[PDB]
Amino acid sequence: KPGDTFEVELAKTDGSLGISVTVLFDKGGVNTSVRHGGIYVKAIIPKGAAESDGRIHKGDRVLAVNGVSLEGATHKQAVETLRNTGQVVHLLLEKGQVP
Numbered sequence: 001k002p003g004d005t006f007e008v009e010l011a012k013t014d015g016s017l018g019i020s021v022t023v024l025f026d027k028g029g030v031n032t033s034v035r036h037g038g039i040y041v042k043a044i045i046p047k048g049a050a051e052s053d054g055r056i057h058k059g060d061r062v063l064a065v066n067g068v069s070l071e072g073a074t075h076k077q078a079v080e081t082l083r084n085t086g087q088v089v090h091l092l093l094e095k096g097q098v099p
Contacts, residue, residue: 002095003031005063008055011048011088018049019056021082023075030097031061038063039070039078040096057098064092 010017024037032038039062041050050056064070065081066089073081082089 002097003061004095005092006055006095007066007090007092008053009088009090010050010053010056013048013052015047017079017082017089018044018047018051020045021062021075021078023073023078030059031094036071037061038094039073039075056093057096059096059098061094061096062091063094066090067092 010019019041020043021039022042023039029035029037041056041058041060041062043058044051044056062070062078065078065085068081070078070081082091
């Protein structure tokens, strides 16, 4: 559903995740304005990964990484955790909105 939680198994082919995420670019919130934002996939850069698996698009909400809630994280901290994770990263997402 367009706000469902899916722990996506995002497998890195080589050059890290294909998702360029932001924490939240403050323009309110595409689902959570009164609530804190998590992390958002801003875009997909080739690689494979998100685009290849075909789950994540340029607007899905990232809640966490394998249950490690990204609440109050800046985009870098999210990605730092996404770099601490190995070849296949599990991310806890919610369906976002597309551009």
